[PDB]
CSV table of C-alpha atoms and ligand atoms in Angstrom, one decimal:
chain,number,residue,atom,x,y,z
A,1,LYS,CA,316.6,157.0,72.4
A,2,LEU,CA,320.4,156.2,71.7
A,3,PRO,CA,322.6,156.7,68.9
A,4,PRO,CA,322.6,154.0,66.1
A,5,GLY,CA,323.6,150.5,67.7
A,6,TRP,CA,323.7,151.8,71.5
A,7,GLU,CA,322.0,149.7,73.9
A,8,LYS,CA,321.8,149.5,77.8
A,9,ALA,CA,322.8,146.6,79.8
A,10,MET,CA,323.5,145.6,83.7
A,11,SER,CA,327.1,145.2,84.8
A,12,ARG,CA,327.1,141.3,86.4
A,13,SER,CA,329.9,142.3,88.6
A,14,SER,CA,328.9,146.0,89.8
A,15,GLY,CA,325.3,146.3,89.1
A,16,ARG,CA,326.0,149.9,87.4
A,17,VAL,CA,324.1,150.1,84.1
A,18,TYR,CA,326.5,150.5,80.8
A,19,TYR,CA,326.3,150.8,77.3
A,20,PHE,CA,327.0,148.8,74.7
A,21,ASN,CA,327.1,148.8,70.6
A,22,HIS,CA,326.1,145.8,68.8
A,23,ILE,CA,327.5,146.9,65.4
A,24,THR,CA,330.9,147.9,66.8
A,25,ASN,CA,331.1,145.9,69.9
A,26,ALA,CA,332.1,149.0,72.2
A,27,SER,CA,331.2,149.0,75.6
A,28,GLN,CA,331.9,152.0,78.0
A,29,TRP,CA,330.3,153.0,81.2
A,30,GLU,CA,329.4,156.7,79.9
A,31,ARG,CA,326.0,157.4,77.9
A,32,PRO,CA,327.5,157.7,74.2
A,33,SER,CA,327.7,161.3,72.4
A,34,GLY,CA,324.3,162.1,70.4
A,35,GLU,CA,325.6,159.7,57.9
A,36,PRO,CA,328.7,160.9,55.9
A,37,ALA,CA,329.4,160.0,52.4
A,38,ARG,CA,333.1,158.6,53.5
A,39,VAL,CA,334.8,158.1,57.0
A,40,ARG,CA,338.7,157.7,57.5
A,41,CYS,CA,339.6,154.8,59.8
A,42,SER,CA,342.7,153.2,61.2
A,43,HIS,CA,342.6,149.5,62.2
A,44,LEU,CA,344.7,147.0,64.2
A,45,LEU,CA,344.3,143.2,62.7
A,46,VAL,CA,344.8,139.9,64.6
A,47,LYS,CA,344.9,137.2,62.1
A,48,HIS,CA,344.3,133.5,62.8
A,49,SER,CA,344.2,130.0,61.4
A,50,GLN,CA,340.9,130.4,59.9
A,51,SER,CA,341.4,134.0,58.3
A,52,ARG,CA,341.2,134.2,54.5
A,53,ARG,CA,345.1,134.5,53.9
A,54,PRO,CA,346.5,132.9,57.0
A,55,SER,CA,349.7,134.9,56.6
A,56,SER,CA,351.2,138.4,57.1
A,57,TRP,CA,354.3,140.6,57.1
A,58,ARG,CA,354.8,139.5,60.9
A,59,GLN,CA,354.5,135.6,60.2
A,60,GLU,CA,354.7,133.5,57.1
A,61,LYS,CA,352.6,130.9,58.5
A,62,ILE,CA,349.9,132.3,60.8
A,63,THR,CA,348.9,129.2,63.2
A,64,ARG,CA,347.3,131.1,66.3
A,65,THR,CA,343.6,129.8,67.0
A,66,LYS,CA,340.6,132.4,66.5
A,67,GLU,CA,340.3,132.2,70.5
A,68,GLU,CA,344.0,133.1,70.9
A,69,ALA,CA,343.5,135.9,68.5
A,70,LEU,CA,340.5,137.3,70.1
A,71,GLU,CA,342.5,137.4,73.5
A,72,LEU,CA,345.1,139.2,72.1
A,73,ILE,CA,342.7,141.8,70.7
A,74,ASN,CA,341.4,141.9,74.1
A,75,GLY,CA,344.5,142.5,75.6
A,76,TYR,CA,345.5,145.4,73.1
A,77,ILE,CA,341.9,147.2,74.0
A,78,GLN,CA,342.9,146.9,77.7
A,79,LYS,CA,346.4,148.6,77.2
A,80,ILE,CA,344.6,151.4,74.8
A,81,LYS,CA,341.7,152.2,77.5
A,82,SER,CA,344.2,152.2,80.3
A,83,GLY,CA,346.7,154.5,78.5
A,84,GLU,CA,349.5,152.0,78.9
A,85,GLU,CA,349.9,152.1,75.2
A,86,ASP,CA,348.7,154.2,72.0
A,87,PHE,CA,346.3,152.6,69.1
A,88,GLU,CA,349.1,153.9,66.8
A,89,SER,CA,351.9,152.3,68.6
A,90,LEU,CA,350.1,148.8,68.8
A,91,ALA,CA,349.0,148.9,65.4
A,92,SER,CA,352.3,149.6,64.0
A,93,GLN,CA,354.1,146.9,66.1
A,94,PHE,CA,351.3,144.1,66.0
A,95,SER,CA,349.0,144.7,63.3
A,96,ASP,CA,348.8,141.9,60.6
A,97,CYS,CA,347.6,144.2,58.2
A,98,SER,CA,350.2,145.8,55.8
A,99,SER,CA,348.8,149.2,56.9
A,100,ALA,CA,350.8,148.5,59.9
A,101,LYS,CA,353.7,150.5,58.3
A,102,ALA,CA,351.0,153.6,58.3
A,103,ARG,CA,350.1,153.2,62.0
A,104,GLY,CA,347.0,151.2,61.0
A,105,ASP,CA,345.8,153.9,58.5
A,106,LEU,CA,343.4,152.9,55.8
A,107,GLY,CA,342.6,156.5,54.4
A,108,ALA,CA,338.8,157.5,53.8
A,109,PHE,CA,336.5,155.3,52.2
A,110,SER,CA,332.8,154.6,51.1
A,111,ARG,CA,330.2,152.0,51.6
A,112,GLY,CA,330.5,149.3,49.6
A,113,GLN,CA,334.4,149.1,49.5
A,114,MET,CA,335.5,147.1,52.7
A,115,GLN,CA,334.1,144.0,54.0
A,116,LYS,CA,330.5,144.5,55.6
A,117,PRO,CA,331.1,144.2,59.3
A,118,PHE,CA,334.2,146.2,59.0
A,119,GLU,CA,332.3,148.8,57.1
A,120,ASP,CA,329.3,148.7,59.1
A,121,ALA,CA,331.3,149.4,62.3
A,122,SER,CA,333.3,152.0,60.7
A,123,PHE,CA,329.9,154.1,59.8
A,124,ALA,CA,328.5,153.4,63.2
A,125,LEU,CA,331.9,154.9,65.0
A,126,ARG,CA,331.7,158.6,65.6
A,127,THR,CA,335.1,160.7,64.7
A,128,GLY,CA,337.6,159.8,67.8
A,129,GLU,CA,335.6,156.8,68.8
A,130,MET,CA,337.3,152.9,69.0
A,131,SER,CA,335.5,149.6,68.2
A,132,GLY,CA,335.6,146.4,70.4
A,133,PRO,CA,336.6,143.4,68.5
A,134,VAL,CA,335.1,143.0,65.2
A,135,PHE,CA,335.1,140.2,63.0
A,136,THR,CA,335.6,139.7,59.3
A,137,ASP,CA,337.0,136.8,57.0
A,138,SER,CA,340.3,138.5,57.6
A,139,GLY,CA,340.7,138.1,61.2
A,140,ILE,CA,339.5,140.2,64.0
A,141,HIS,CA,339.9,144.2,63.9
A,142,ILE,CA,340.1,147.1,66.4
A,143,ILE,CA,338.9,150.0,64.7
A,144,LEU,CA,339.5,153.9,65.2
A,145,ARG,CA,337.6,156.4,63.4
A,146,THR,CA,339.8,159.4,62.6
A,147,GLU,CA,337.6,161.7,60.2
B,201,LIG,C1,331.0,159.7,76.0
B,201,LIG,C2,332.0,158.4,75.4
B,201,LIG,O1,331.7,158.1,74.4
B,201,LIG,C3,333.0,157.9,76.2
B,201,LIG,C4,333.5,158.6,77.2
B,201,LIG,C5,334.6,158.1,77.8
B,201,LIG,N1,334.8,156.8,77.1
B,201,LIG,C6,333.6,157.1,76.1
B,202,LIG,C1,357.7,148.8,55.6
B,202,LIG,C2,356.8,147.5,55.3
B,202,LIG,O1,356.9,146.7,54.3
B,202,LIG,C3,355.9,147.3,56.2
B,202,LIG,C4,355.1,146.3,56.2
B,202,LIG,C5,354.4,146.3,57.7
B,202,LIG,N1,355.0,147.2,58.3
B,202,LIG,C6,356.0,147.8,57.7
B,203,LIG,C1,338.8,147.0,56.2
B,203,LIG,C2,339.0,145.5,55.6
B,203,LIG,O1,337.9,145.1,55.4
B,203,LIG,C3,340.0,144.9,56.1
B,203,LIG,C4,341.1,145.5,56.2
B,203,LIG,C5,342.2,144.2,56.0
B,203,LIG,N1,341.7,143.2,55.8
B,203,LIG,C6,340.3,143.5,55.8
């Protein structure tokens, strides 16, 4: 019916159908477009107090809660989708990953290299597409597939 991970749901406020992906947590009004050895992705990470290493180049001691980190992630997604801000600009400024210095770029990778929920979302993304909040032991990610 639909590409991997995608399902149909009903909007609670509008009553119009929308599409949601249970691997990437993406959601959108438009019906999605219809696997490679490798993909290339960028990401923006927001760490919290329960991350594996609650520290980053931005903050020696990361103290925000998981709920607070998710609110930040949701805010960044809103600004990306509205075009108020670019993914690469937010990732350079706010990602708790050292990959911030490269606009969030992680380079290319295969299955069996990254944390599983990150890997699964990355390979379920099509080129150009972006995830919703993706949860790993490191924190909460926004993932942009570039190749
Ligand atoms: C087709 C698709 O994936 C789109 C279109 C606008 N946003 C997402
Ligand atoms: C140049 C450098 O170390 C970094 C780390 C994160 N952003 C920039
Ligand atoms: C892709 C992945 O698993 C990462 C990246 C930074 N922390 C975890």
